[PDB]
């Protein structure tokens, strides 16, 4: 889904298909977290977890 690692090896996962520039909009079970907040953007939360 998406994380962060040793140096950065940037943002391994689906955000690695989204911050690297492989693709635009990422309709998914991607969960809003503050490490993800600073690196890419999100919608409003549509479900609760």
């Amino acid at each position: 889904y998406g994380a962060r690692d040793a140096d950065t090896k940037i943002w391994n996962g689906m955000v690695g298909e989204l911050v690297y520039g492989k693709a635009d909009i990422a309709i998914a079970p991607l969960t809003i977290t503050l490490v993800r907040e600073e690196v890419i953007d999100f919608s409003k939360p549509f479900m609760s977890l």
């Binding site: 889904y1 994380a3 635009d24 079970p29 479900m47 609760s48």
Partner: protein
Amino acid sequence: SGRIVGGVWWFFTLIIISSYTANLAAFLTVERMVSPIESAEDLSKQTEIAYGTLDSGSTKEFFRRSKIAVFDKMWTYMRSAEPSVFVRTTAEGVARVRKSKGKYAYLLESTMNEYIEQRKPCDTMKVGGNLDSKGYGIATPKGSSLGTPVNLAVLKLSEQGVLDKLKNKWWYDKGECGAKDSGSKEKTSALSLSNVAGVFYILVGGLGLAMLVALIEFCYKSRAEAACGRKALTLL
């Protein structure tokens, strides 16, 4: 001479029966003490069960970062894995619960966990409350033109009532396992027939023996109508 045999056999039947009603009141008051795991801080003590979550998701980040200090202890044993308690993925994570036979717990998100327990091998259940709260979000790259149209969409799609219809849509019908949790909220505590069953089989099997002995003496009554015992005894 003959009351002492009846004397101590009367003592022998006092200790065996009173041992028997002891331990049968010691299975049933031991396996009633066993509280199932119902919270994470309860699971924080219970080192018997293996608790690993998804690797390389937000959940592995959550136990590593926060400091509620039940979770710090939870991360600590999770970091001291033997073997690797992170699985790699959720579909492999379900099977590690499936194949440990009540020995591997699996931390995952609520919306996925409710769907997994609504699947045809119903042998999983959502244990406690939510450890935290987060949200699902649709992702755009950092400051792109696609941001605010989708951002205006989910705001619009909320009060249109569509995204929570979609919340139903792929979940509401998915009780196709049967939802057997619906008929088990009593957690009944009396003995069932399953506990005392072999007695009735001894009870019925005693009756089925005793009718055939009632037949075998009536035929022996009628065939008797139509040193012999000593020599028969002397051979035997």
